[PDB]
Amino acid sequence: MQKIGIYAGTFDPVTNGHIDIIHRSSELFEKLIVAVAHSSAKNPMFSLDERLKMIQLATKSFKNVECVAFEGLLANLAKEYHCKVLVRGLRVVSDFEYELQMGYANKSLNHELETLYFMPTLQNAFISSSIVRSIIAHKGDASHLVPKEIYPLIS
Amino acid sequence: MQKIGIYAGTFDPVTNGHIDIIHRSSELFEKLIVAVAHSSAKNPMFSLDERLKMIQLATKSFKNVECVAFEGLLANLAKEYHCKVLVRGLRVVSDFEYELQMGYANKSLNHELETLYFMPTLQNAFISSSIVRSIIAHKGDASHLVPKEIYPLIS
Amino acid sequence: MQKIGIYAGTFDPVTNGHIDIIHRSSELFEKLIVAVAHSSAKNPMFSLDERLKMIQLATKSFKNVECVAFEGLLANLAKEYHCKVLVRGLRVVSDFEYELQMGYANKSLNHELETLYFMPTLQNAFISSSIVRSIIAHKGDASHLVPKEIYPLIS
Amino acid sequence: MQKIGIYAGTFDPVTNGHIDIIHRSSELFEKLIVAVAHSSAKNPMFSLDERLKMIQLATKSFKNVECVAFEGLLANLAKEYHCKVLVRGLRVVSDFEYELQMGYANKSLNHELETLYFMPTLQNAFISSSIVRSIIAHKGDASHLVPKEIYPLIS
Amino acid sequence: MQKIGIYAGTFDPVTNGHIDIIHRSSELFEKLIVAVAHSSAKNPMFSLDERLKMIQLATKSFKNVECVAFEGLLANLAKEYHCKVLVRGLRVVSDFEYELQMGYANKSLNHELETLYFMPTLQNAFISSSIVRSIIAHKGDASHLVPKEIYPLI
Amino acid sequence: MQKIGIYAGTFDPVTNGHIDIIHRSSELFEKLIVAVAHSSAKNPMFSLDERLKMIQLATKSFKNVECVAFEGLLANLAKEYHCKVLVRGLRVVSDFEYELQMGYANKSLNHELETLYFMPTLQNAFISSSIVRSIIAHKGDASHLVPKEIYPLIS
Ligand SMILES: CC(C)(COP(=O)(O)OP(=O)(O)OC[C@H]1O[C@@H](n2cnc3c(N)ncnc32)[C@H](O)[C@@H]1O)[C@@H](O)C(=O)NCCC(=O)NCCS
Ligand SMILES: CC(C)(COP(=O)(O)OP(=O)(O)OC[C@H]1O[C@@H](n2cnc3c(N)ncnc32)[C@H](O)[C@@H]1O)[C@@H](O)C(=O)NCCC(=O)NCCS
Ligand SMILES: CC(C)(COP(=O)(O)OP(=O)(O)OC[C@H]1O[C@@H](n2cnc3c(N)ncnc32)[C@H](O)[C@@H]1O)[C@@H](O)C(=O)NCCC(=O)NCCS
Ligand SMILES: CC(C)(COP(=O)(O)OP(=O)(O)OC[C@H]1O[C@@H](n2cnc3c(N)ncnc32)[C@H](O)[C@@H]1O)[C@@H](O)C(=O)NCCC(=O)NCCS
Ligand SMILES: CC(C)(COP(=O)(O)OP(=O)(O)OC[C@H]1O[C@@H](n2cnc3c(N)ncnc32)[C@H](O)[C@@H]1O)[C@@H](O)C(=O)NCCC(=O)NCCS
Ligand SMILES: CC(C)(COP(=O)(O)OP(=O)(O)OC[C@H]1O[C@@H](n2cnc3c(N)ncnc32)[C@H](O)[C@@H]1O)[C@@H](O)C(=O)NCCC(=O)NCCS
């Protein structure tokens, strides 16, 4: 069960909160895949290639994390990796009922596939991606919110 | 009262959750109108015609159910049908304060018009149209979440 | 479904919000039973006998409304009345997920039994028995929040 | 803290609930600035020019209120005004975790800045701009929802 | 309106989050009454008198704050103080709807009486009295959650 | 983190939802401690010693599960076991903000301690102990809600 975990998200862009989830889940799983979803339907600020790149940069220090981009269904991805656990992060503005709904839906698509939830550090519990984007977009400084190593990309 | 209720939605597509609500509310009113709102402001995956046709098939065997598409205010639709009851379904990811707000906005518009809520079966309380569309858009199989009569259409 | 609904509650005391729901739901069923549960496990300010008398006085003028006190499981009460509908009132402080949970817990005990929800008028949608008790217990005037018929008794 | 507050919003259009907050919060600070954000990401129905004008019109008779439009970060706006108070209104469908989040995001951008919350009158605690927009989109009458002096600009 | 604000609560015990609210709201009002309710029905861990002393001690450095104990209805207290503003704090576990409901109920009991909300610092937004009492009762150290000067009292 | 998890609760009585969480988290750590708290402040229907015994009986077939009763702080308990992870289950009626609060309060008391959340089967996601207690108290049958093993010890 601990062989491999998938932490999937849009990561638009990766923030300090995402990093705390990667930092702790990567302890539990021998390998942690960070799966960056295309999510074209959301309308991401940063492209799929830019978002993959930021998150690869911000996760170099984790030796067992590999980041991939993917365009299909997450449940099938997991089936490809032989993965039986999706990792999600829970924070203050988490839509908790939607997390449960998506966990059951992913399990109904792949009967092997569990969802497990982590928490970020308390300081980072109020960080969301959409605030970061709002800050960037009105040309403000969001460097206290996202890993310093991606800042020159999002600046 | 008793003589007619209207269960309005975007139904994009109709799911086993919406069918549960039709099944139950159709027991309480002589006639249940299933009303498919244009809802162009959301950006439905399926056209108004496709969504009417699908809910018509999935409701073929409910004797007292009649499906219609409409473009204007639901409050005015009710008035047209001499209807003083709107039907809504409550489920796990319902925005419950939004439901209340919509019910008082509707009564605002048509002073005789009450809102009444039913629940789906426990199995279908976690089904949402957006998860179903996310599945369908990423090539997944959503036939376990929508009535069998529509699968030839949404695939 | 059309002939009898039970609106069950502690009613400690009955409030303007509870009357709203009786008014509304009594329009939808041939008969509405207002069932006052013992609920001795809460620690009702008013006795079962007082809560029944209170709700009897405040409902005296509704033609199809009958009030009863009961001690056992509401699902068994419904069965005794050949009733397949439980009535609940949804308001601003409602614990919405607990409502669903109770609805399904009721159905698991009596497989025929559905729960249906009504709203009170907007003015009364913030009224709670808890606040009315707190007012009354701290010597304040609660008469704007409960039916006038009962005010003689709660003071 | 006593001298000035800024009530920021997209105001699309200004409704009776916004006005309540303006009335209430204008009573707590020597000067209130009503700041209309561009908010181009929310795709407003009404342009920034029209929303400024409508709020000016609706606020004309408050002695200590001035309205401004702004394109930049609200936290730098408050800096400009030597303001350490952001005013927000709390209503039934407020997403409360996200208000807290935004208050700490504003404070993480300008360290002296607090967010203070007021409530509207109870009758207006259910009004949202989203519902006004849906009403007028569907050429219904939302005149009971927005101040008389803006109605002709929105018909 | 800025003359006097009342910040009411059970304060069982006062925590760091309460003090953040007192710190900010005492900037807006020329006098801040911190009103310690008896709150019998909630079965406080600490007696009314003990709660009153802890909070008086924790708030002595705020020169325009006075703490009082009260047993009646808060809307009636505000009336005797000529106060038109109740101060409440909002945090992560706040029952938001219950705040709105009690704001309207206090308004319906006193027509001039508004409710205004503040936030604590982010580090203190997850502090609750009940978590403090849990720690105290199972004999752990909560000194990081309450003002340290009240620690020997608790 | 991979070696041990502690799933702490009042377990009053153990229900099919808790068993789901025990099944699931036991697949994620090499040992699972099911820790029965005294919780004298809650007012448990069953004594510590009954709730220990029922949970032992209900978990006797999980090979890597140990049940213990404890009176002190969970965070010290975790220390004494060289355990970095508390397991919690998330269900429909979870108070989500209070979980996150308790996770940060536990981590305040033992700086290495993480909280991880599992979901029960969808069918048991509406089961709570309080509703089981209510059924038992009112002499109804709650044997569909708690493991067969403990049913004799409940009625
Ligand atoms: C993209 C998916 C994973 C949704 O991801 P989401 O939009 O939530 O991504 P996002 O970048 O916002 O967040 C990433 C993860 O970190 C969590 N998180 C976000 N901010 C924080 C923070 N400050 N702290 C801790 N966790 C956080 C989120 O809860 C999530 O777990 C989902 O849409 C998906 O699976 N898409 C693929 C197609 C598919 O299979 N959909 C069918 C799903 S049933
Ligand atoms: C279309 C309307 C009714 C909103 O519908 P909504 O977007 O909620 O439709 P949707 O298809 O998502 O849901 C339909 C109904 O099924 C319920 N439901 C959805 N999924 C489920 C499920 N699994 N189980 C049970 N019920 C469910 C919904 O709560 C709703 O009651 C509304 O926007 C409307 O009235 N539009 C017309 C214009 C108008 O008058 N607007 C003014 C509103 S004041
Ligand atoms: C007594 C029962 C129904 C729960 O009642 P509850 O405590 O919600 O009673 P209360 O008097 O608070 O409310 C009565 C009803 O009016 C609603 N309501 C309350 N205030 C308002 C208001 N201002 N406006 C509209 N509705 C209102 C409640 O939501 C409920 O629908 C329940 O505990 C029960 O069924 N007891 C019997 C034993 C049993 O069978 N329990 C098993 C449950 S699985
Ligand atoms: C525009 C801002 C303030 C968000 O505003 P919002 O979308 O909430 O505006 P809106 O017009 O919807 O509401 C205005 C205010 O009235 C409140 N409100 C709305 N309806 C009601 C009602 N019926 N009663 C009481 N209050 C109400 C809202 O809660 C809000 O406080 C925010 O996007 C912002 O600051 N933008 C500027 C750029 C910036 O600095 N962004 C980064 C933020 S970290
Ligand atoms: C005691 C009253 C004020 C309610 O108090 P409450 O239980 O919320 O007190 P508590 O001690 O828990 O909290 C005190 C205040 O600080 C806030 N708060 C608590 N923790 C924190 C924190 N970490 N950060 C910020 N604020 C916080 C609470 O929201 C509240 O604003 C109410 O019961 C009351 O008025 N009682 C008197 C009788 C009365 O008039 N009742 C009728 C009311 S309609
Ligand atoms: C006892 C503790 C763990 C709280 O337990 P709680 O009251 O939640 O136990 P309860 O028996 O309700 O539930 C047990 C666990 O199963 C979960 N759960 C309950 N029902 C279900 C269900 N249907 N499905 C899934 N999970 C469920 C609960 O969420 C919880 O995770 C807490 O009080 C504690 O740690 N006490 C020890 C003293 C201590 O250290 N306290 C200070 C904490 S900061």
Short mmCIF file of C-alpha atoms in Angstrom, two decimals, chain F residues 61-117:
data_model
loop_
_atom_site.label_atom_id
_atom_site.label_comp_id
_atom_site.label_asym_id
_atom_site.label_seq_id
_atom_site.Cartn_x
_atom_site.Cartn_y
_atom_site.Cartn_z
CA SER F 61 -9.52 -10.71 13.24
CA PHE F 62 -7.33 -7.71 11.99
CA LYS F 63 -3.87 -9.09 12.47
CA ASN F 64 -1.91 -5.93 12.98
CA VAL F 65 -4.37 -4.09 15.22
CA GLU F 66 -3.89 -3.65 19.05
CA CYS F 67 -6.69 -2.10 21.24
CA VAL F 68 -5.84 -0.11 24.39
CA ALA F 69 -7.73 2.17 26.81
CA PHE F 70 -6.08 5.38 27.91
CA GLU F 71 -6.81 8.20 30.41
CA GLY F 72 -4.28 10.87 29.57
CA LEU F 73 -3.45 13.07 26.59
CA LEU F 74 -3.35 11.44 23.14
CA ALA F 75 -0.25 13.36 22.17
CA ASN F 76 1.68 11.79 25.11
CA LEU F 77 0.25 8.42 24.27
CA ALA F 78 1.67 8.77 20.73
CA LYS F 79 5.05 9.63 22.24
CA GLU F 80 5.06 6.62 24.47
CA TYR F 81 4.43 4.48 21.33
CA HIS F 82 7.05 6.18 19.16
CA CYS F 83 4.21 7.16 16.84
CA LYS F 84 4.14 10.19 14.56
CA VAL F 85 0.59 9.57 13.07
CA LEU F 86 -3.00 9.96 14.52
CA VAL F 87 -5.63 8.41 12.29
CA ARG F 88 -9.04 10.06 12.03
CA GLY F 89 -12.02 9.09 9.94
CA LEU F 90 -13.88 11.70 7.89
CA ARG F 91 -17.60 11.27 7.35
CA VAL F 92 -20.59 13.33 6.20
CA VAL F 93 -21.37 14.77 9.61
CA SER F 94 -17.68 15.43 10.53
CA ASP F 95 -17.05 18.87 11.98
CA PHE F 96 -14.30 19.56 9.62
CA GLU F 97 -12.89 22.75 11.08
CA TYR F 98 -12.81 21.11 14.55
CA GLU F 99 -10.75 18.17 13.09
CA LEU F 100 -8.23 20.51 11.71
CA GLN F 101 -8.20 22.46 14.97
CA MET F 102 -7.64 19.23 16.97
CA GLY F 103 -4.85 18.17 14.53
CA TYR F 104 -3.03 21.48 15.15
CA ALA F 105 -3.72 21.30 19.02
CA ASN F 106 -2.24 17.74 19.02
CA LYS F 107 0.76 18.90 17.02
CA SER F 108 1.15 21.80 19.64
CA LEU F 109 1.55 19.22 22.29
CA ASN F 110 3.95 16.92 20.40
CA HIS F 111 5.74 18.64 17.54
CA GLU F 112 6.32 15.61 15.39
CA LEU F 113 2.71 14.43 15.46
CA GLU F 114 0.75 14.35 12.11
CA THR F 115 -3.00 13.68 11.67
CA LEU F 116 -4.12 11.67 8.64
CA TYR F 117 -7.75 11.14 7.59
#
